[PDB]
Design a protein around this ligand. Structure first.
Ligand SMILES: [Ca+2]
Ligand SMILES: [Ca+2]
Ligand SMILES: [Ca+2]
Ligand SMILES: [Ca+2]
Ligand SMILES: [Ca+2]
Ligand SMILES: [Ca+2]
Ligand SMILES: [Ca+2]
Ligand SMILES: [Fe+3]
Ligand SMILES: [Fe+3]
Lengths: 308, 310
Protein backbone atom coordinates (compact mmCIF):
# COMPACT_ATOMS: atom_id res chain seq x y z
CA UNK A 1 0.00 0.00 0.00
CA UNK A 2 0.91 3.69 -0.31
CA UNK A 3 -0.46 5.89 2.48
CA UNK A 4 2.13 8.66 2.75
CA UNK A 5 0.09 11.26 0.86
CA UNK A 6 -3.09 10.71 2.88
CA UNK A 7 -4.42 13.43 5.15
CA UNK A 8 -4.21 11.11 8.15
CA UNK A 9 -0.45 10.64 7.70
CA UNK A 10 0.26 14.30 6.96
CA UNK A 11 -1.74 15.30 10.04
CA UNK A 12 0.19 12.78 12.12
CA UNK A 13 3.48 14.30 10.94
CA UNK A 14 2.34 17.84 11.76
CA UNK A 15 1.22 16.80 15.24
CA UNK A 16 4.37 14.78 15.93
CA UNK A 17 6.63 17.73 15.07
CA UNK A 18 4.23 20.20 16.77
CA UNK A 19 4.19 22.48 13.72
CA UNK A 20 0.91 24.03 14.94
CA UNK A 21 2.20 24.62 18.47
CA UNK A 22 2.83 27.72 20.55
CA UNK A 23 5.89 29.80 19.72
CA UNK A 24 8.88 27.56 20.27
CA UNK A 25 12.02 26.23 18.60
CA UNK A 26 10.94 26.67 15.00
CA UNK A 27 14.25 25.46 13.54
CA UNK A 28 14.16 22.27 15.58
CA UNK A 29 10.54 21.59 14.60
CA UNK A 30 11.42 22.19 10.93
CA UNK A 31 14.30 19.70 11.06
CA UNK A 32 12.30 17.06 12.94
CA UNK A 33 9.34 17.36 10.57
CA UNK A 34 11.61 16.99 7.53
CA UNK A 35 13.46 13.97 8.88
CA UNK A 36 10.26 12.28 10.06
CA UNK A 37 8.47 12.97 6.78
CA UNK A 38 11.40 11.57 4.80
CA UNK A 39 11.50 8.47 7.02
CA UNK A 40 7.76 7.85 6.62
CA UNK A 41 8.00 8.31 2.85
CA UNK A 42 10.93 5.88 2.62
CA UNK A 43 9.00 3.28 4.64
CA UNK A 44 6.05 3.67 2.25
CA UNK A 45 8.14 3.64 -0.95
CA UNK A 46 10.30 0.63 -0.04
CA UNK A 47 7.50 -1.18 1.85
CA UNK A 48 9.70 -1.37 4.93
CA UNK A 49 8.00 -3.88 7.22
CA UNK A 50 7.37 -3.46 10.95
CA UNK A 51 9.93 -6.21 11.60
CA UNK A 52 12.52 -4.24 9.63
CA UNK A 53 11.64 -0.98 11.42
CA UNK A 54 11.90 -2.57 14.86
CA UNK A 55 15.28 -4.03 13.91
CA UNK A 56 16.38 -0.49 13.02
CA UNK A 57 14.99 0.80 16.33
CA UNK A 58 16.91 -1.94 18.16
CA UNK A 59 20.03 -0.95 16.25
CA UNK A 60 19.71 2.63 17.49
CA UNK A 61 19.56 1.33 21.06
CA UNK A 62 22.76 -0.65 20.51
CA UNK A 63 24.48 2.23 18.72
CA UNK A 64 24.01 4.56 21.67
CA UNK A 65 24.70 1.88 24.27
CA UNK A 66 28.04 1.34 22.50
CA UNK A 67 28.62 5.11 22.35
CA UNK A 68 29.32 4.77 18.63
CA UNK A 69 26.98 7.25 16.88
CA UNK A 70 29.95 9.44 15.85
CA UNK A 71 31.92 6.41 14.65
CA UNK A 72 28.97 5.46 12.45
CA UNK A 73 28.81 9.06 11.22
CA UNK A 74 32.35 8.56 9.92
CA UNK A 75 31.76 5.08 8.50
CA UNK A 76 28.64 5.97 6.48
CA UNK A 77 30.31 9.02 4.98
CA UNK A 78 28.29 11.65 6.83
CA UNK A 79 31.44 13.17 8.32
CA UNK A 80 33.08 13.39 4.89
CA UNK A 81 29.86 14.87 3.50
CA UNK A 82 30.11 17.74 5.97
CA UNK A 83 33.61 18.42 4.60
CA UNK A 84 32.27 18.31 1.03
CA UNK A 85 29.77 21.04 1.88
CA UNK A 86 32.42 23.16 3.63
CA UNK A 87 34.78 22.73 0.66
CA UNK A 88 32.03 23.81 -1.72
CA UNK A 89 31.46 26.97 0.30
CA UNK A 90 35.18 27.79 0.26
CA UNK A 91 35.38 27.15 -3.49
CA UNK A 92 32.40 29.42 -4.15
CA UNK A 93 34.13 32.11 -2.07
CA UNK A 94 37.25 31.88 -4.23
CA UNK A 95 39.52 30.36 -1.59
CA UNK A 96 42.49 28.26 -2.66
CA UNK A 97 45.97 27.57 -1.39
CA UNK A 98 45.15 26.32 2.10
CA UNK A 99 46.01 22.86 3.32
CA UNK A 100 42.92 20.73 2.60
CA UNK A 101 40.62 19.90 5.48
CA UNK A 102 39.65 16.38 6.34
CA UNK A 103 37.55 14.69 8.98
CA UNK A 104 38.23 15.09 12.69
CA UNK A 105 37.03 11.61 13.60
CA UNK A 106 35.63 10.83 17.06
CA UNK A 107 38.81 10.51 19.13
CA UNK A 108 40.04 14.01 19.99
CA UNK A 109 40.79 14.56 23.69
CA UNK A 110 40.93 18.13 24.98
CA UNK A 111 43.48 19.42 27.47
CA UNK A 112 46.89 18.25 26.22
CA UNK A 113 49.76 20.33 27.63
CA UNK A 114 51.18 22.91 25.23
CA UNK A 115 54.94 23.08 24.63
CA UNK A 116 57.02 25.70 22.84
CA UNK A 117 58.39 24.50 19.50
CA UNK A 118 58.93 20.81 20.22
CA UNK A 119 56.99 18.14 22.11
CA UNK A 120 57.80 14.52 22.85
CA UNK A 121 54.43 12.80 22.94
CA UNK A 122 55.13 9.05 23.29
CA UNK A 123 54.76 8.55 27.03
CA UNK A 124 54.20 4.78 26.95
CA UNK A 125 56.65 2.24 25.59
CA UNK A 126 55.54 0.45 22.43
CA UNK A 127 58.16 -2.03 21.23
CA UNK A 128 56.49 -2.67 17.88
CA UNK A 129 56.36 1.03 16.86
CA UNK A 130 59.49 2.73 15.55
CA UNK A 131 60.46 6.33 16.29
CA UNK A 132 58.96 9.12 14.20
CA UNK A 133 59.64 12.86 14.00
CA UNK A 134 56.85 14.99 12.52
CA UNK A 135 57.92 18.55 11.76
CA UNK A 136 56.92 21.41 9.55
CA UNK A 137 56.29 25.10 9.11
CA UNK A 138 52.91 26.82 9.48
CA UNK A 139 52.23 29.71 7.08
CA UNK A 140 49.26 31.72 5.91
CA UNK A 141 48.04 31.78 2.33
CA UNK A 142 50.28 34.82 1.76
CA UNK A 143 53.31 32.58 2.40
CA UNK A 144 54.38 34.26 5.64
CA UNK A 145 55.26 32.04 8.63
CA UNK A 146 52.86 32.17 11.58
CA UNK A 147 54.63 32.46 14.94
CA UNK A 148 52.81 31.26 18.04
CA UNK A 149 50.31 29.18 16.06
CA UNK A 150 48.92 26.18 17.93
CA UNK A 151 49.57 22.79 16.27
CA UNK A 152 47.83 19.84 17.92
CA UNK A 153 48.09 16.20 16.90
CA UNK A 154 46.77 12.84 18.02
CA UNK A 155 47.32 9.32 16.69
CA UNK A 156 47.20 5.60 17.46
CA UNK A 157 49.78 3.19 18.86
CA UNK A 158 51.08 0.02 17.18
CA UNK A 159 47.93 -1.86 18.21
CA UNK A 160 45.66 0.74 16.63
CA UNK A 161 44.55 2.25 19.94
CA UNK A 162 44.45 5.86 21.13
CA UNK A 163 44.92 7.03 24.68
CA UNK A 164 41.57 7.48 26.48
CA UNK A 165 40.02 4.89 24.09
CA UNK A 166 42.15 1.78 24.67
CA UNK A 167 40.04 -1.26 25.66
CA UNK A 168 43.07 -3.40 26.62
CA UNK A 169 44.15 -1.14 29.48
CA UNK A 170 44.45 2.55 30.25
CA UNK A 171 47.31 4.40 28.58
CA UNK A 172 49.05 7.31 30.25
CA UNK A 173 46.90 10.40 29.85
CA UNK A 174 47.66 12.12 26.55
CA UNK A 175 49.89 9.36 25.23
CA UNK A 176 50.46 10.14 21.53
CA UNK A 177 48.65 13.48 21.91
CA UNK A 178 50.36 16.83 21.97
CA UNK A 179 50.23 20.52 21.27
CA UNK A 180 53.04 22.86 20.21
CA UNK A 181 53.19 26.63 19.77
CA UNK A 182 55.20 27.37 16.65
CA UNK A 183 58.49 29.24 16.98
CA UNK A 184 59.27 32.62 15.43
CA UNK A 185 59.83 30.96 12.03
CA UNK A 186 56.55 29.06 12.15
CA UNK A 187 58.17 25.73 13.01
CA UNK A 188 56.65 22.90 15.05
CA UNK A 189 57.99 19.45 15.87
CA UNK A 190 56.61 16.29 17.47
CA UNK A 191 58.79 13.39 18.56
CA UNK A 192 56.59 10.32 18.64
CA UNK A 193 56.24 6.73 17.40
CA UNK A 194 54.81 5.53 14.09
CA UNK A 195 51.03 4.93 14.07
CA UNK A 196 49.30 1.89 12.66
CA UNK A 197 45.81 1.83 11.21
CA UNK A 198 42.92 0.29 13.05
CA UNK A 199 39.44 -1.15 12.79
CA UNK A 200 36.11 -0.57 14.47
CA UNK A 201 35.27 -2.39 17.73
CA UNK A 202 34.46 -5.84 16.33
CA UNK A 203 31.29 -6.45 18.37
CA UNK A 204 30.09 -2.85 18.18
CA UNK A 205 27.21 -1.27 16.33
CA UNK A 206 29.28 0.36 13.57
CA UNK A 207 30.95 -2.90 12.56
CA UNK A 208 27.60 -4.71 12.78
CA UNK A 209 26.13 -2.36 10.18
CA UNK A 210 29.26 -2.56 8.01
CA UNK A 211 29.12 -6.36 8.14
CA UNK A 212 25.52 -6.17 6.95
CA UNK A 213 26.63 -4.02 4.02
CA UNK A 214 29.60 -6.26 3.21
CA UNK A 215 32.13 -3.53 4.05
CA UNK A 216 35.28 -3.48 6.16
CA UNK A 217 35.69 -1.04 9.04
CA UNK A 218 39.41 -0.29 8.79
CA UNK A 219 41.42 2.90 8.42
CA UNK A 220 44.95 3.30 7.07
CA UNK A 221 47.58 4.76 9.38
CA UNK A 222 47.28 8.52 9.88
CA UNK A 223 47.97 11.44 12.22
CA UNK A 224 45.24 13.96 13.10
CA UNK A 225 45.81 17.72 13.37
CA UNK A 226 44.08 20.83 14.62
CA UNK A 227 45.96 24.00 13.65
CA UNK A 228 45.02 27.52 14.64
CA UNK A 229 46.49 30.98 14.88
CA UNK A 230 45.62 34.62 15.39
CA UNK A 231 44.02 36.06 12.27
CA UNK A 232 43.25 32.64 10.77
CA UNK A 233 40.57 29.98 10.73
CA UNK A 234 40.98 26.74 12.64
CA UNK A 235 42.09 23.91 10.34
CA UNK A 236 41.07 20.29 10.91
CA UNK A 237 43.25 18.00 8.82
CA UNK A 238 45.40 14.87 8.88
CA UNK A 239 48.08 13.12 6.98
CA UNK A 240 48.31 9.50 5.93
CA UNK A 241 51.38 7.30 6.14
CA UNK A 242 52.45 6.64 2.57
CA UNK A 243 52.44 3.06 1.36
CA UNK A 244 49.66 1.80 3.64
CA UNK A 245 47.66 -0.76 1.61
CA UNK A 246 44.37 0.82 2.77
CA UNK A 247 45.41 4.39 2.02
CA UNK A 248 42.72 4.77 -0.68
CA UNK A 249 40.21 2.42 0.99
CA UNK A 250 39.52 4.20 4.28
CA UNK A 251 36.15 3.17 5.68
CA UNK A 252 35.67 6.85 6.63
CA UNK A 253 36.59 8.26 3.20
CA UNK A 254 39.16 10.71 4.62
CA UNK A 255 42.22 10.42 2.39
CA UNK A 256 43.25 13.35 0.19
CA UNK A 257 46.14 13.33 -2.26
CA UNK A 258 47.80 16.50 -0.88
CA UNK A 259 47.90 14.93 2.61
CA UNK A 260 50.30 12.04 1.90
CA UNK A 261 53.83 13.33 2.66
CA UNK A 262 57.04 11.44 1.95
CA UNK A 263 58.67 9.49 4.79
CA UNK A 264 62.46 9.88 5.08
CA UNK A 265 64.88 7.56 6.85
CA UNK A 266 67.20 9.42 9.25
CA UNK A 267 70.02 8.81 11.71
CA UNK A 268 71.08 10.72 14.81
CA UNK A 269 67.97 9.80 16.77
CA UNK A 270 69.55 9.40 20.20
CA UNK A 271 70.66 13.04 20.32
CA UNK A 272 66.99 13.97 19.77
CA UNK A 273 65.85 11.71 22.59
CA UNK A 274 64.51 9.00 20.28
CA UNK A 275 64.75 5.37 21.39
CA UNK A 276 67.05 4.43 18.49
CA UNK A 277 69.60 6.09 16.23
CA UNK A 278 67.60 5.21 13.12
CA UNK A 279 64.20 6.87 12.87
CA UNK A 280 61.68 8.15 10.34
CA UNK A 281 60.96 11.81 9.60
CA UNK A 282 57.87 13.34 7.99
CA UNK A 283 57.92 17.00 6.97
CA UNK A 284 54.30 18.24 6.94
CA UNK A 285 53.99 21.94 6.17
CA UNK A 286 50.64 23.57 6.85
CA UNK A 287 48.91 26.61 5.30
CA UNK A 288 46.09 28.33 7.21
CA UNK A 289 43.26 30.34 5.68
CA UNK A 290 42.73 33.90 6.98
CA UNK A 291 39.60 34.90 8.83
CA UNK A 292 36.94 36.77 6.86
CA UNK A 293 36.13 40.09 8.56
CA UNK A 294 37.37 38.57 11.81
CA UNK A 295 35.08 35.53 11.55
CA UNK A 296 35.69 31.79 11.20
CA UNK A 297 32.69 30.41 9.27
CA UNK A 298 33.71 26.73 9.56
CA UNK A 299 34.88 25.96 13.11
CA UNK A 300 32.90 23.04 14.52
CA UNK A 301 31.60 22.65 18.06
CA UNK A 302 30.87 19.03 18.93
CA UNK A 303 31.16 16.88 22.06
CA UNK A 304 34.79 15.99 22.73
CA UNK A 305 36.42 14.01 25.49
CA UNK A 306 38.75 15.70 27.95
CA UNK A 307 41.36 14.69 30.52
CA UNK A 308 43.72 16.22 33.07
CA UNK B 1 24.04 28.11 1.24
CA UNK B 2 25.62 25.58 -1.10
CA UNK B 3 23.81 22.77 -2.91
CA UNK B 4 26.06 19.74 -3.37
CA UNK B 5 23.66 16.80 -3.14
CA UNK B 6 23.18 16.31 -6.88
CA UNK B 7 26.92 16.12 -7.68
CA UNK B 8 28.87 13.05 -8.75
CA UNK B 9 31.16 13.31 -5.72
CA UNK B 10 28.24 13.02 -3.31
CA UNK B 11 26.37 10.36 -5.30
CA UNK B 12 29.56 8.30 -5.56
CA UNK B 13 30.06 8.65 -1.80
CA UNK B 14 26.52 7.41 -1.15
CA UNK B 15 27.01 4.40 -3.45
CA UNK B 16 30.27 3.51 -1.72
CA UNK B 17 28.89 3.97 1.80
CA UNK B 18 25.95 1.64 1.09
CA UNK B 19 28.20 -0.71 -0.95
CA UNK B 20 25.83 -0.78 -3.91
CA UNK B 21 28.67 -1.84 -6.23
CA UNK B 22 29.99 -4.45 -3.79
CA UNK B 23 30.09 -8.20 -4.18
CA UNK B 24 26.94 -10.29 -3.77
CA UNK B 25 25.48 -9.48 -0.35
CA UNK B 26 22.33 -8.28 1.40
CA UNK B 27 20.83 -6.24 -1.43
CA UNK B 28 17.69 -5.30 0.53
CA UNK B 29 19.68 -3.95 3.48
CA UNK B 30 21.96 -2.01 1.14
CA UNK B 31 18.92 -0.55 -0.64
CA UNK B 32 17.38 0.64 2.63
CA UNK B 33 20.63 2.12 3.91
CA UNK B 34 21.27 3.92 0.62
CA UNK B 35 17.77 5.42 0.65
CA UNK B 36 17.97 6.61 4.27
CA UNK B 37 21.48 8.03 3.84
CA UNK B 38 20.53 9.74 0.59
CA UNK B 39 17.46 11.30 2.19
CA UNK B 40 19.54 12.45 5.17
CA UNK B 41 22.22 14.00 2.95
CA UNK B 42 19.54 15.73 0.86
CA UNK B 43 17.83 17.11 3.96
CA UNK B 44 21.14 18.46 5.26
CA UNK B 45 21.67 20.15 1.88
CA UNK B 46 18.12 21.51 1.55
CA UNK B 47 17.84 22.89 5.10
CA UNK B 48 21.54 23.89 5.30
CA UNK B 49 21.94 21.85 8.46
CA UNK B 50 25.26 22.94 9.96
CA UNK B 51 27.97 20.63 11.27
CA UNK B 52 27.20 21.83 14.80
CA UNK B 53 23.56 20.82 14.31
CA UNK B 54 24.54 17.43 12.86
CA UNK B 55 26.89 16.67 15.75
CA UNK B 56 24.15 17.59 18.23
CA UNK B 57 21.93 15.07 16.45
CA UNK B 58 24.69 12.43 16.63
CA UNK B 59 25.07 13.19 20.35
CA UNK B 60 21.32 12.73 20.78
CA UNK B 61 21.50 9.27 19.21
CA UNK B 62 24.20 8.31 21.70
CA UNK B 63 21.96 9.45 24.56
CA UNK B 64 18.88 7.77 23.06
CA UNK B 65 20.55 4.36 23.01
CA UNK B 66 22.34 4.83 26.33
CA UNK B 67 18.88 5.47 27.84
CA UNK B 68 17.49 2.43 26.03
CA UNK B 69 14.69 4.60 24.68
CA UNK B 70 14.68 4.18 20.88
CA UNK B 71 11.36 2.28 21.00
CA UNK B 72 9.83 4.91 23.28
CA UNK B 73 10.82 7.62 20.81
CA UNK B 74 9.35 5.50 18.01
CA UNK B 75 6.00 5.73 19.82
CA UNK B 76 6.36 9.40 20.71
CA UNK B 77 7.08 10.69 17.19
CA UNK B 78 4.26 8.67 15.66
CA UNK B 79 6.33 6.01 13.91
CA UNK B 80 4.62 3.20 15.82
CA UNK B 81 1.17 4.57 14.93
CA UNK B 82 2.33 4.96 11.32
CA UNK B 83 3.10 1.24 11.11
CA UNK B 84 -0.49 0.61 12.22
CA UNK B 85 -1.79 3.02 9.56
CA UNK B 86 0.05 1.00 6.90
CA UNK B 87 -1.18 -2.33 8.31
CA UNK B 88 -4.76 -1.01 8.41
CA UNK B 89 -4.47 0.12 4.78
CA UNK B 90 -3.21 -3.31 3.73
CA UNK B 91 -6.05 -5.01 5.60
CA UNK B 92 -8.62 -2.78 3.95
CA UNK B 93 -7.27 -3.57 0.48
CA UNK B 94 -7.21 -7.31 1.28
CA UNK B 95 -10.59 -7.52 3.01
CA UNK B 96 -8.93 -8.49 6.31
CA UNK B 97 -10.40 -5.47 8.12
CA UNK B 98 -13.30 -7.27 9.82
CA UNK B 99 -11.75 -7.87 13.25
CA UNK B 100 -11.41 -5.77 16.37
CA UNK B 101 -9.19 -2.76 15.53
CA UNK B 102 -5.48 -2.95 16.24
CA UNK B 103 -3.44 -0.36 18.04
CA UNK B 104 0.16 0.01 19.10
CA UNK B 105 1.97 -2.51 21.29
CA UNK B 106 4.22 0.00 23.02
CA UNK B 107 7.61 -1.03 24.42
CA UNK B 108 6.65 -2.76 27.70
CA UNK B 109 5.52 -6.32 26.92
CA UNK B 110 7.21 -9.05 28.99
CA UNK B 111 7.08 -12.70 27.91
CA UNK B 112 6.63 -15.53 30.40
CA UNK B 113 3.54 -14.59 32.40
CA UNK B 114 1.52 -17.42 33.96
CA UNK B 115 -1.43 -18.76 31.97
CA UNK B 116 -4.73 -19.75 33.55
CA UNK B 117 -7.87 -21.37 32.18
CA UNK B 118 -10.79 -18.94 31.93
CA UNK B 119 -10.04 -16.52 34.78
CA UNK B 120 -6.81 -14.96 36.02
CA UNK B 121 -6.07 -12.71 38.99
CA UNK B 122 -3.12 -10.55 37.99
CA UNK B 123 -2.69 -8.02 40.83
CA UNK B 124 0.10 -9.70 42.81
CA UNK B 125 1.16 -6.57 44.71
CA UNK B 126 -1.09 -4.40 46.82
CA UNK B 127 -1.71 -0.86 45.56
CA UNK B 128 -3.85 1.10 48.00
CA UNK B 129 -4.58 3.89 45.52
CA UNK B 130 -6.00 1.64 42.76
CA UNK B 131 -9.51 0.26 42.92
CA UNK B 132 -10.54 -3.22 41.80
CA UNK B 133 -11.27 -3.89 38.13
CA UNK B 134 -12.71 -6.90 36.30
CA UNK B 135 -12.01 -7.14 32.56
CA UNK B 136 -13.98 -9.78 30.72
CA UNK B 137 -15.24 -10.66 27.30
CA UNK B 138 -15.74 -13.27 24.63
CA UNK B 139 -13.39 -14.08 21.75
CA UNK B 140 -15.04 -14.93 18.42
CA UNK B 141 -13.95 -15.18 14.83
CA UNK B 142 -15.27 -12.81 12.20
CA UNK B 143 -18.04 -15.38 11.56
CA UNK B 144 -19.26 -14.90 15.15
CA UNK B 145 -18.39 -18.38 16.43
CA UNK B 146 -16.62 -18.50 19.82
CA UNK B 147 -12.94 -19.49 19.85
CA UNK B 148 -12.11 -21.96 22.60
CA UNK B 149 -8.57 -22.09 23.90
CA UNK B 150 -7.57 -18.74 22.44
CA UNK B 151 -4.80 -16.96 24.34
CA UNK B 152 -5.68 -13.54 25.77
CA UNK B 153 -2.70 -11.69 27.23
CA UNK B 154 -2.82 -8.38 29.00
CA UNK B 155 -0.47 -5.98 30.71
CA UNK B 156 -0.96 -2.58 32.34
CA UNK B 157 0.39 -0.04 34.82
CA UNK B 158 -0.21 0.44 38.55
CA UNK B 159 -1.60 3.58 40.27
CA UNK B 160 1.81 5.27 39.95
CA UNK B 161 1.93 4.66 36.19
CA UNK B 162 4.61 1.95 36.42
CA UNK B 163 4.70 -1.56 34.95
CA UNK B 164 6.36 -4.57 36.50
CA UNK B 165 9.88 -5.12 35.11
CA UNK B 166 10.09 -1.37 34.28
CA UNK B 167 9.49 0.27 37.68
CA UNK B 168 12.32 2.68 38.61
CA UNK B 169 11.11 3.17 42.21
CA UNK B 170 11.60 -0.46 43.26
CA UNK B 171 11.01 -3.94 41.91
CA UNK B 172 7.46 -5.20 41.59
CA UNK B 173 6.71 -8.87 41.92
CA UNK B 174 7.46 -10.56 38.60
CA UNK B 175 4.43 -10.31 36.31
CA UNK B 176 2.46 -7.98 38.55
CA UNK B 177 -0.45 -6.76 36.41
CA UNK B 178 0.51 -9.15 33.60
CA UNK B 179 -1.43 -12.28 32.77
CA UNK B 180 -2.66 -14.69 30.16
CA UNK B 181 -5.93 -16.60 29.96
CA UNK B 182 -6.90 -19.51 27.72
CA UNK B 183 -10.53 -18.92 26.78
CA UNK B 184 -13.06 -21.49 27.94
CA UNK B 185 -15.14 -23.70 25.66
CA UNK B 186 -17.47 -20.76 24.96
CA UNK B 187 -14.72 -18.22 24.18
CA UNK B 188 -14.85 -16.43 27.54
CA UNK B 189 -11.92 -14.81 29.35
CA UNK B 190 -11.77 -12.79 32.56
CA UNK B 191 -9.05 -10.88 34.40
CA UNK B 192 -9.31 -9.63 37.97
CA UNK B 193 -6.93 -6.73 38.50
CA UNK B 194 -6.67 -3.12 39.66
CA UNK B 195 -7.41 0.06 37.71
CA UNK B 196 -4.44 1.49 35.74
CA UNK B 197 -3.36 5.12 35.68
CA UNK B 198 -1.61 6.87 32.80
CA UNK B 199 2.04 7.80 32.84
CA UNK B 200 4.75 9.93 31.29
CA UNK B 201 8.17 9.40 29.79
CA UNK B 202 11.25 9.29 32.05
CA UNK B 203 11.74 13.01 32.65
CA UNK B 204 15.53 13.11 32.13
CA UNK B 205 15.47 10.64 29.24
CA UNK B 206 16.10 11.21 25.57
CA UNK B 207 12.46 10.94 24.50
CA UNK B 208 11.27 13.66 26.87
CA UNK B 209 14.27 15.80 25.92
CA UNK B 210 13.19 15.78 22.27
CA UNK B 211 9.52 16.30 23.15
CA UNK B 212 10.51 19.27 25.34
CA UNK B 213 12.43 20.67 22.37
CA UNK B 214 9.26 20.42 20.29
CA UNK B 215 7.03 21.87 23.02
CA UNK B 216 5.11 18.58 23.49
CA UNK B 217 4.18 16.59 26.58
CA UNK B 218 5.14 12.94 26.93
CA UNK B 219 2.06 11.56 28.71
CA UNK B 220 -0.36 8.74 27.97
CA UNK B 221 -3.93 8.29 29.21
CA UNK B 222 -4.73 5.19 31.24
CA UNK B 223 -5.02 1.99 29.19
CA UNK B 224 -4.71 -1.80 29.16
CA UNK B 225 -2.70 -3.68 26.52
CA UNK B 226 -3.71 -6.94 24.85
CA UNK B 227 -2.35 -9.65 22.62
CA UNK B 228 -4.97 -12.15 21.43
CA UNK B 229 -4.04 -15.25 19.45
CA UNK B 230 -5.51 -18.58 18.50
CA UNK B 231 -5.08 -21.49 16.13
CA UNK B 232 -6.28 -20.61 12.65
CA UNK B 233 -6.35 -16.85 13.30
CA UNK B 234 -4.09 -13.83 13.11
CA UNK B 235 -2.56 -12.42 16.28
CA UNK B 236 -4.26 -9.19 17.38
CA UNK B 237 -2.32 -6.39 19.09
CA UNK B 238 -4.75 -3.96 20.69
CA UNK B 239 -5.59 -2.00 23.82
CA UNK B 240 -8.46 -0.22 25.43
CA UNK B 241 -8.52 3.20 27.04
CA UNK B 242 -10.16 4.02 30.36
CA UNK B 243 -13.19 6.21 29.72
CA UNK B 244 -13.00 9.74 31.12
CA UNK B 245 -9.23 10.20 31.23
CA UNK B 246 -8.49 13.87 30.42
CA UNK B 247 -5.67 12.78 28.06
CA UNK B 248 -7.73 10.16 26.26
CA UNK B 249 -7.56 12.08 22.96
CA UNK B 250 -4.13 13.65 23.58
CA UNK B 251 -1.90 10.56 23.85
CA UNK B 252 1.73 11.40 23.06
CA UNK B 253 1.89 8.07 21.17
CA UNK B 254 -1.30 8.64 19.13
CA UNK B 255 -2.80 5.25 20.03
CA UNK B 256 -6.40 6.02 21.01
CA UNK B 257 -9.20 4.74 18.77
CA UNK B 258 -12.89 5.47 19.23
CA UNK B 259 -13.77 1.76 18.90
CA UNK B 260 -11.50 0.95 21.87
CA UNK B 261 -13.03 3.06 24.69
CA UNK B 262 -15.39 0.63 26.45
CA UNK B 263 -18.16 1.48 28.87
CA UNK B 264 -17.06 1.15 32.51
CA UNK B 265 -19.76 -0.31 34.77
CA UNK B 266 -20.06 0.01 38.55
CA UNK B 267 -20.64 -3.31 40.32
CA UNK B 268 -20.98 -4.61 43.86
CA UNK B 269 -20.24 -8.02 45.33
CA UNK B 270 -16.47 -7.77 44.99
CA UNK B 271 -15.47 -9.70 48.10
CA UNK B 272 -17.06 -12.90 46.81
CA UNK B 273 -14.77 -12.63 43.76
CA UNK B 274 -11.64 -12.07 45.84
CA UNK B 275 -11.47 -8.33 45.35
CA UNK B 276 -10.57 -5.98 48.15
CA UNK B 277 -13.78 -3.93 48.30
CA UNK B 278 -17.48 -4.54 47.78
CA UNK B 279 -17.63 -1.96 44.98
CA UNK B 280 -15.62 -2.56 41.83
CA UNK B 281 -15.58 -1.64 38.15
CA UNK B 282 -16.18 -4.01 35.24
CA UNK B 283 -15.11 -3.43 31.64
CA UNK B 284 -16.49 -5.70 28.93
CA UNK B 285 -14.01 -6.02 26.05
CA UNK B 286 -15.00 -8.53 23.39
CA UNK B 287 -12.54 -9.60 20.69
CA UNK B 288 -13.17 -10.59 17.07
CA UNK B 289 -10.20 -12.31 15.40
CA UNK B 290 -9.55 -12.61 11.69
CA UNK B 291 -8.91 -16.09 10.22
CA UNK B 292 -5.55 -16.62 8.59
CA UNK B 293 -5.38 -15.91 4.88
CA UNK B 294 -3.55 -18.77 3.14
CA UNK B 295 -2.48 -20.25 6.44
CA UNK B 296 -0.01 -17.49 7.34
CA UNK B 297 -0.19 -14.38 9.50
CA UNK B 298 1.32 -11.54 7.46
CA UNK B 299 0.83 -8.81 10.07
CA UNK B 300 2.34 -10.42 13.19
CA UNK B 301 5.37 -8.42 14.37
CA UNK B 302 8.68 -9.73 15.68
CA UNK B 303 10.57 -7.19 17.77
CA UNK B 304 12.83 -7.38 20.82
CA UNK B 305 10.74 -7.99 23.93
CA UNK B 306 11.66 -8.47 27.57
CA UNK B 307 11.16 -11.79 29.32
CA UNK B 308 11.30 -13.10 32.87
CA UNK B 309 10.65 -16.12 35.07
CA UNK B 310 7.65 -16.22 37.40
CA1 LIG C 1 44.67 32.30 -4.16
CA1 LIG D 1 57.67 7.13 29.36
CA1 LIG E 1 49.03 -1.05 27.58
CA1 LIG F 1 12.56 13.10 -1.04
CA1 LIG G 1 -2.89 -8.33 47.13
CA1 LIG H 1 3.40 25.13 26.01
CA1 LIG I 1 -6.80 -16.00 45.18
FE1 LIG J 1 42.18 8.39 13.77
FE1 LIG K 1 1.22 1.15 28.15
Amino acid sequence: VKVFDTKEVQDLLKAAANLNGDAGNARFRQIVHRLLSDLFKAIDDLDITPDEVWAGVNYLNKLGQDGEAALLAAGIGLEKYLDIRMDAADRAAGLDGGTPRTIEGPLYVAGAPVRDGVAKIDLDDDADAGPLVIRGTVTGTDGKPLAGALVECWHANSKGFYSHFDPTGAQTAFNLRGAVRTDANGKYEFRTLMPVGYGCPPQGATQQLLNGLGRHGNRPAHVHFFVSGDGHRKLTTQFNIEGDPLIWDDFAYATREELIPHVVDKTGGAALGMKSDAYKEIEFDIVLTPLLDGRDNQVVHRPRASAD
